[PDB]
Amino acid sequence: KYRVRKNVLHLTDTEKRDFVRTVLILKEKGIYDRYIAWHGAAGKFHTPPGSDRNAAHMSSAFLPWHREYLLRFERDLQSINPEVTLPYWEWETDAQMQDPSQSQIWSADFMGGNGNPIKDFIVDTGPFAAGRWTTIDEQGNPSGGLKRNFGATKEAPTLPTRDDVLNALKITQYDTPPWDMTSQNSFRNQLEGFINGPQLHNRVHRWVGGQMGVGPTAPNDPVFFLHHANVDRIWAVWQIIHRNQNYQPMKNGPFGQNFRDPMYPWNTTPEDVMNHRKLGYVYDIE
Numbered sequence: 001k002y003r004v005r006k007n008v009l010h011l012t013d014t015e016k017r018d019f020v021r022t023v024l025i026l027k028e029k030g031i032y033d034r035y036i037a038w039h040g041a042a043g044k045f046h047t048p049p050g051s052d053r054n055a056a057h058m059s060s061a062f063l064p065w066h067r068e069y070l071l072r073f074e075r076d077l078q079s080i081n082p083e084v085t086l087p088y089w090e091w092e093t094d095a096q097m098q099d100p101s102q103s104q105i106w107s108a109d110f111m112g113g114n115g116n117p118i119k120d121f122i123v124d125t126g127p128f129a130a131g132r133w134t135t136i137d138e139q140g141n142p143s144g145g146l147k148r149n150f151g152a153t154k155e156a157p158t159l160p161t162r163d164d165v166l167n168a169l170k171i172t173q174y175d176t177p178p179w180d181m182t183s184q185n186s187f188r189n190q191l192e193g194f195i196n197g198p199q200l201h202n203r204v205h206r207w208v209g210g211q212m213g214v215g216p217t218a219p220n221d222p223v224f225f226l227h228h229a230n231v232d233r234i235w236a237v238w239q240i241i242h243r244n245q246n247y248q249p250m251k252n253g254p255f256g257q258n259f260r261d262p263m264y265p266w267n268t269t270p271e272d273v274m275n276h277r278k279l280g281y282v283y284d285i286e
């Protein structure tokens with residue numbers, strides 16, 4: 001309840017400067033790379049093998065997986081700078097703008113801007129511009145630059161709306177069998193965005209483009225964590241609202257998806273991260 005995750009737009013220039021600096025440090029130290037690989041590994045871990053579901057996506061573990069993932073990242077920032085916490089990108093408000101790409105999150109002192117269509121959508125502004133920040137491909141080999149291409153996709157010309165987010169918060173069950181991308185009247189499948197996809201979470205990735213367009217390379221873009229911080233806030237808000245609801249499946253789901261299963265690549269369980277306050281953080285909106 002001490003660490004407070006703030007909205008990006010409420011950040012002081014110094015806070016924004018300190019977040020970036022710490023992320024750059026994690027990168028230099030070789031720590032940042034551990035996160036990208038954990039994510040890649042996870043999406044490759046199929047539950048069960050042959051199934052669509054994996055440890056980190058397309059099933060019930062989606063929400064807790066990333067919560068643990070973000071918890072570990074924040075602790076790592078914290079080891080560098082005890083004053084630094086993970087902010088969130090409230091994409092639903094930016095979506096209200098005439099031109100969302102005009103959001104302050106993309107300023108040169110923070111995330112940097114859109115991709116340069118002359119350099120194949122390589123990002124050349126900001127702290128994470130090519131030549132300042134090295135990227136890795138799916139194979140673990142250098143890929144040579146952050147790429148972004150906002151709203152370029154026919155399927156996802158726009159970010160998700162405030163109404164889209166409110167409509168997910170109305171769903172009663174955390175998830176429903178068969179605990180996959182076809183799960184109906186499920187908050188998890190809804191938020192993840194497979195209901196008439198891409199919506200919500202999935203929709204943000206498609207809208208951002210570049211590495212953020214494809215799962216395995218998503219975290220190469222530091223905006224990945226800001227986005228997942230916002231996703232985690234929505235879940236946390238749901239938990240407050242539907243407080244007689246609990247995680248599902250409690251059992252009989254596939255191994256890795258149940259309440260008390262370890263979440264590959266770690267030993268952490270969904271039970272372990274069910275209460276975010278217990279983890280030592282809370283979002284501003286409280």
Ligand SMILES: [Cu+2]
Nearest residue numbers: 039056057066
């Ligand atoms: Cu993920």
Ligand SMILES: [Cu+2]
Nearest residue numbers: 201205218228
């Ligand atoms: Cu994601």
